[PDB]
Design an enzyme around this catalytic site. Structure first.
Site, PDB file in Angstrom:
ATOM      1  N   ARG D  27       0.824  -1.206   0.000  1.00  0.00           N
ATOM      2  CA  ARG D  27       0.000   0.000   0.000  1.00  0.00           C
ATOM      3  C   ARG D  27       0.860   1.258   0.000  1.00  0.00           C
ATOM      4  O   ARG D  27       0.632   2.184  -0.786  1.00  0.00           O
ATOM      5  CB  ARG D  27      -0.936  -0.005   1.210  1.00  0.00           C
TER       6      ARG D  27
HETATM    7  N1  LIG Z   1      -3.881   2.689 -10.550  1.00  0.00           N
HETATM    8  C1  LIG Z   1      -3.102   2.058  -9.640  1.00  0.00           C
HETATM    9  N2  LIG Z   1      -1.772   2.284  -9.583  1.00  0.00           N
HETATM   10  C2  LIG Z   1      -0.987   1.661  -8.686  1.00  0.00           C
HETATM   11  N3  LIG Z   1      -1.445   0.779  -7.782  1.00  0.00           N
HETATM   12  C3  LIG Z   1      -2.759   0.456  -7.724  1.00  0.00           C
HETATM   13  C4  LIG Z   1      -3.681   1.096  -8.673  1.00  0.00           C
HETATM   14  N4  LIG Z   1      -4.907   0.614  -8.408  1.00  0.00           N
HETATM   15  C5  LIG Z   1      -4.784  -0.258  -7.376  1.00  0.00           C
HETATM   16  N5  LIG Z   1      -3.507  -0.350  -6.963  1.00  0.00           N
HETATM   17  C6  LIG Z   1      -3.027  -1.218  -5.860  1.00  0.00           C
HETATM   18  O1  LIG Z   1      -4.149  -1.697  -5.115  1.00  0.00           O
HETATM   19  C7  LIG Z   1      -3.904  -1.614  -3.710  1.00  0.00           C
HETATM   20  C8  LIG Z   1      -5.130  -1.082  -2.980  1.00  0.00           C
HETATM   21  O2  LIG Z   1      -6.109  -2.111  -2.870  1.00  0.00           O
HETATM   22  P1  LIG Z   1      -7.377  -1.911  -1.901  1.00  0.00           P
HETATM   23  O3  LIG Z   1      -8.316  -0.916  -2.537  1.00  0.00           O
HETATM   24  O4  LIG Z   1      -6.865  -1.668  -0.502  1.00  0.00           O
HETATM   25  O5  LIG Z   1      -8.080  -3.358  -1.932  1.00  0.00           O
HETATM   26  P2  LIG Z   1      -9.372  -3.651  -1.020  1.00  0.00           P
HETATM   27  O6  LIG Z   1     -10.392  -2.652  -1.511  1.00  0.00           O
HETATM   28  O7  LIG Z   1      -9.709  -5.089  -1.325  1.00  0.00           O
HETATM   29  O8  LIG Z   1      -8.890  -3.408   0.389  1.00  0.00           O
HETATM   30  C9  LIG Z   1      -2.716  -0.691  -3.510  1.00  0.00           C
HETATM   31  O9  LIG Z   1      -1.719  -1.342  -2.719  1.00  0.00           O
HETATM   32  C10 LIG Z   1      -2.177  -0.407  -4.895  1.00  0.00           C
HETATM   33  O10 LIG Z   1      -0.812  -0.825  -4.986  1.00  0.00           O
END
Ligand SMILES: Nc1ncnc2c1ncn2[C@@H]1O[C@H](COP(=O)(O)OP(=O)(O)O)[C@@H](O)[C@H]1O
Ligand SMILES: Nc1ncnc2c1ncn2[C@@H]1O[C@H](COP(=O)(O)OP(=O)(O)OP(=O)(O)O)[C@@H](O)[C@H]1O
Ligand SMILES: [Mg+2]
Ligand SMILES: [Mg+2]
Lengths: 47, 493, 464, 50
Positions: D27
């Site tokens: 993250r």
């Molecule tokens: N456009 C993007 N660019 C870079 N990373 C992304 C992008 N979209 C999603 N991610 C990755 O997705 C992760 C976030 O997922 P998250 O929304 O927390 O999943 P959930 O909703 O299941 O908890 C981040 O760690 C990020 O690295």
């Protein structure tokens, strides 16, 4: 001629694989059904 | 005078009442604040009851009165063009509805000796099922598929196709329409009502609706009141068509209301008797004999399935119950076939006596080359090496499968359908680009309504075609073929 | 008239009252904890009526330290929250307590939290259009003003970053008011979102309320009602266009599940409560916006175990329109927008409503993608040479299509190190029409990755 | 706030760390890293996945 023979052999090798996969899928489905019905009846009559 | 009880339990829309020794089963009960209840589980200590309407107005000191009535609904003839809740109150502000009679919801279906055969056409606007799987008066047909395939569109098209029939004053051809909406979003109800109103068909149809906010158990008994409304007209030599928007949610509501009280659970926690409910609901539609009057009722249920699993409990039960089946595949819908209906497996078990003789003649020819094209689709890669007969069959199948698709909210007249199918099956589609096949015929159809409308009148009167008719049609085709210009160059025969 | 506690077991409590003083449903009660190490004022919400004047109630905060015989005081009314335009610009608790400063706004007007939905007569369909600046959304699943929008997908897919991007794209330069709620989210995300909002100039016109995962089950099924109460007050009294943001609504359902066992309710097929559909329907009906007023609501939902046949998501699909879906394969193959074009659709799209060129382009591209999928299913084993020229042409065109479908993003620029951009609708439709025509076949697919617009395409292509 | 996935297949294959770049994310990302590492590394994860 060799291509014909090989292709026929390939079909005759694919069909029984399909049959085996179908059998495995059927047994898996039955096992799943038994699993959830056992779980729900146990949860229900545990009260 | 009348027996009065108390309240001992309250929760999740369930109430237990002690008292009322003389109460009968399924008797409506009254609670303070104008609250309605239904007795559903009797016992020597106390009786259970599901709560209709308000819930949070229930405590442990309320008094209960019995209405001495089982179940009923006003079933007058003033419900046309009105929206009504399952209980009977009008949702709109247009005012109350005059009523004439009150009938129960638990009447016996007509017996075997009161039945009769089925031979009437009951035509619809969809040419994809008229020539494939005929539907007749008093016959039960089911439509199955996945979400967002387009089944409600077919339903509303069938509903609004009856305008021309209603135009005439003959009571032997007028068809009444009942729509039941179960557990849906209110905005969707408003949208479909607006679509019907702008279609002009609101003058001969009725709608009963139960949105997703009805936690009182109204979702349990909407089809019962719909069928009760239909039966009054059906016992008077009048033809009615009833549509159920969904039935899976009905089963879910019944399962929840059973589980809330004590009920032994079977497969998937479903209660003891599910098949009986659907059987006794769907065995009301029947073509009466001539002595009883001749009225008829035709039903259309709807079932939703997940991941094309037709081996589940409810789909299996409904398939066993029903009389004809139609299948919709989301893969076909994405492919580009707007009527996603799959001709491979969908079958109607009636003898084909419903339809008219000309389309009876042409459907037999259609089936053969449809099957030929279906089986011979793999050889598209090496089409050069195939035989001339195989190439001709492939091209005919391609043109046919291109012909069937239609845009929504466009019902077709029976004469128009017959002419289109006859044109398709007589080899007149040769030397025509496939894409323009969708366009060309439509324009050609319009020309027939301009200068040569007598053919439709002859088909209406005689229900068949003559040699003069076919020679006139072939002459008109030869005339129009040269006039039409292809989207890519031009070519005629 | 106080009554007393009789049983304590986890979150659920059992209370008894003298005859005649039994409280009605959904009321509120107060209890005291006298232990020195942990002193609190427990608030109880009655939920089950029983015989002998006993009631089963749920707790609002952890119940460690409570004993038997402690008296309880009755409020006589449901929980209430402060209302008015004087609450925006502050972060609030589930019960309405201001985190920034205690005892703030306690003189405001406070009213009910549980109300009936509006009548059917006032309902009215809403058909409109709003631009977003994203390639996928503007083409395949166009949005609508005043409707409902939801984002589906499994765990670890990137939902939160999309939510932040959407609020940055839409909430900025908006005439009306915005309300955001947080249900069962990571506290770090709440903190950094608050900091980011404070960085710009929109926090002065926003009201935030949220409860975290560490809270007991009592809180996880109540914050949404507070957010809806605030939104309803603003819509009904002041009457302006409003935005509503909700995250991971699925947690709400989970909040019921455990209590379903404690209250004695029998379990459903997958251990769910028997009465989930009714409650979710009540909530979604409360969401609705009547004619003459506008509410734009956006939600995100979590798919458990990456399975779409679960009982809960079916009702979400039913109560929705113009949805989007996130899959795992595209995320695995390195496409940042994880939307699946073959499993998402919108109701508003119509040749009469939107237009004919848009419709034809969408149909062509979706058909091409479907053909590519069922061709790849065989070409993955039999090899490329097994097909004819048309099949290879279609495969190459489709490959370019899925490569070009990605884009750079605002809130994710730190990971890439390069700021993103936005594109006009007309440019998107013209570019996709050109791609369907088959003109870009002379360029490598690597130029289509993480691009925006067409001038950037030209620059990147000339860079190689 | 991040996951690392180790599969026995990769360990058997001959990759001693035995981690797949497909489903491993973070993250925080570049914020934690020192800046020099940020410019040197770049988007290597996406290239590996591709
Ligand atoms: N456009 C993007 N660019 C870079 N990373 C992304 C992008 N979209 C999603 N991610 C990755 O997705 C992760 C976030 O997922 P998250 O929304 O927390 O999943 P959930 O909703 O299941 O908890 C981040 O760690 C990020 O690295
Ligand atoms: N013949 C058709 N031609 C073009 N579009 C169609 C046709 N039939 C349906 N559609 C469109 O396909 C979509 C299906 O809508 P519809 O509500 O009827 O689907 P469904 O399968 O009944 O699903 P649900 O009831 O869950 O929404 C709509 O966008 C509708 O406009
Ligand atoms: Mg539909
Ligand atoms: Mg997330």
């Amino acid at each position: 001629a060799s291509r014909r023979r090989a292709m026929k052999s390939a079909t005759d090798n694919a069909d029984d694989l399909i049959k085996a996969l179908t059998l495995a899928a059927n047994r898996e489905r039955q096992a799943q059904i038994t699993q959830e019905i056992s779980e729900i009846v146990g949860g229900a009559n545990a009260l | 005078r009348e027996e009065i009880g108390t309240v001992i339990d309250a929760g999740d829309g369930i109430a237990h009442v002690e008292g009322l020794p003389s109460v009968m089963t399924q008797e409506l009960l009254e609670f303070p604040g104008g609250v309605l209840g239904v007795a559903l589980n009797l016992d020597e200590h106390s009786v259970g009851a599901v709560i209709l309407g308000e819930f949070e107005k229930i405590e442990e000191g309320q008094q209960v009165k019995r209405t001495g009535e089982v179940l009923s609904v006003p079933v007058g003839d003033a419900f046309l063009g009105r929206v009504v809740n399952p209980l009977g109150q009008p949702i709109d502000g247009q005012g109350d509805i005059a009523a004439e009679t009150r009938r129960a919801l638990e009447l016996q279906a007509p017996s075997v000796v009161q039945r009769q055969s089925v031979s009437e056409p009951l035509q619809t606007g969809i040419k994809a099922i008229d020539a494939m799987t005929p539907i007749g008066r008093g016959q039960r047909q089911l439509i199955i598929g996945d979400r967002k395939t387009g089944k409600t569109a077919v339903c509303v098209d069938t509903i609004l196709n009856q305008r021309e029939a209603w135009l005439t004053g003959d009571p032997k051809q007028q068809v009444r329409c009942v729509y039941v909406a179960i557990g849906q979003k209110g905005t969707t109800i408003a949208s479909v009502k607006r679509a019907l109103e702008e279609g002009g068909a609101m003058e001969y149809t009725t709608i009963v609706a139960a949105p997703a906010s009805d936690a009182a158990g109204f979702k349990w008994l909407a089809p019962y009141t719909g069928s009760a409304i239909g039966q009054h007209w059906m016992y008077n030599g009048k033809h009615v068509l009833i549509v159920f928007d969904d039935l899976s949610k009905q089963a879910d509501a019944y399962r929840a209301i059973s589980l809330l009280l004590r009920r032994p659970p079977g497969r998937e926690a479903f209660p003891g008797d599910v098949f009986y409910l659907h059987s006794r609901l769907l065995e009301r539609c029947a073509k009466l004999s001539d002595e009883l009057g001749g009225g008829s009722m035709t039903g259309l249920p709807i079932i939703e399935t997940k991941a094309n699993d037709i081996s589940a409990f409810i789909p299996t039960n409904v398939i066993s119950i029903t009389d004809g089946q139609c299948f919709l595949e989301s893969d076909l819908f994405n492919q580009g076939v707007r009527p996603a209906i799959n001709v491979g497996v969908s079958v109607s078990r009636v003898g084909g006596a419903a339809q008219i003789k000309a389309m009876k003649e042409v459907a037999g020819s259609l089936r053969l080359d449809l099957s030929q094209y279906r089986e011979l689709e793999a050889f598209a890669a090496f089409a050069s090496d195939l035989d001339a007969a195989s190439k001709a069959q492939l091209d005919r199948g391609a043109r046919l499968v291109e012909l069937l698709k239609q845009p929504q909210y466009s019902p077709l007249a029976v004469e128009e359908q017959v002419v289109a199918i006859f044109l398709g099956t007589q080899g007149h589609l040769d030397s025509v680009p496939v894409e323009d096949v969708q366009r060309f015929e439509s324009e050609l159809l319009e020309h027939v309504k301009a200068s040569h409308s007598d053919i439709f009148d002859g088909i209406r009167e005689t229900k068949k075609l003559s040699e003069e008719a076919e020679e006139k049609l072939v002459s008109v085709i030869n005339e129009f073929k040269k006039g039409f210009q292809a989207s890519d160059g031009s070519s005629v025969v | 008239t106080a009554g007393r506690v009789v049983r304590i077991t986890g979150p659920v409590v059992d209370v008894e009252f003298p005859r005649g003083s039994v409280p009605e449903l959904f009321n509120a009660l107060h209890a005291e904890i006298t232990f020195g190490a942990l002193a609190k004022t427990l608030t109880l919400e009655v939920a089950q009526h029983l015989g002998d004047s006993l009631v089963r109630c749920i707790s609002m905060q952890p119940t460690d330290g409570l004993v038997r015989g402690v008296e309880v005081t009755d409020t006589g009314a449901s929980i209430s929250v402060p209302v008015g335009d004087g609450v925006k610009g502050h972060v609030f608790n589930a019960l309405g307590d201001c985190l920034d400063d205690p005892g703030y706004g306690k003189d405001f007007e406070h009213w009910s939290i549980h109300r009936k939905p509006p009548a059917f007569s006032d309902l009215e369909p809403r058909t409109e259009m709003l631009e977003t600046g994203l390639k996928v959304v503007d083409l395949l699943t166009p949005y609508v003003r005043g409707g409902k929008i939801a984002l589906f997908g499994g765990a670890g897919v990137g939902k939160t970053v999309l939510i932040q991007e959407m609020i940055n794209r839409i909430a900025r330069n908006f005439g009306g008011t915005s309300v955001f709620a947080g249900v069962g989210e990571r506290t770090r995300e709440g903190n950094d979102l608050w900091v980011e909002l404070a960085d710009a100039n929109v926090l002065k016109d926003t009201a935030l309320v949220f409860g975290q995962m560490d809270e007991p089950p009592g809180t996880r099924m109540r914050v949404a009602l507070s957010a809806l109460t605030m939104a309803e007050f603003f819509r009904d009294e002041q009457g302006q266009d409003v935005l509503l943001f909700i995250d991971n609504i699925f947690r709400f359902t989970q909040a019921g599940s455990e209590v379903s066992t404690l209250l004695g309710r029998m379990p459903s097929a997958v251990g769910y409560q028997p009465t989930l559909a009714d409650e979710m329907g009540e909530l979604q009906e409360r969401i609705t916006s009547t004619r003459g007023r506008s509410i734009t609501s956006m939600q995100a939902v979590y798919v458990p175990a990456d399975d779409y046949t679960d009982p809960a998501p079916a009702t979400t699909f039913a109560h929705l329109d113009a949805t989007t879906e996130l899959s795992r394969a595209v995320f695995s193959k390195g496409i940042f927008p994880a939307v699946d074009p073959l499993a998402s659709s919108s109701t508003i799209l119509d040749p009469a409503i939107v237009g004919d060129e848009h419709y034809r382009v969408a149909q062509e591209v979706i058909r091409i993608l479907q053909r590519y999928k069922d061709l790849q299913d065989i070409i993955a084993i039999l090899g490329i040479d097994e097909l004819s020229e048309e099949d290879k042409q279609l495969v190459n065109r489709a490959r370019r299509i899925e490569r070009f479908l990605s884009q750079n993003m605002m809130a994710a620029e730190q990971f890439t190190g390069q700021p993103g951009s936005t594109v006009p609708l007309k440019e998107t439709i013209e570019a996709f029409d050109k791609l369907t025509k088959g003109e870009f076949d002379h360029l490598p697919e690597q130029a289509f990755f993480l691009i925006g617009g067409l001038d950037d395409l030209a620059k990147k292509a000339e860079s190689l």
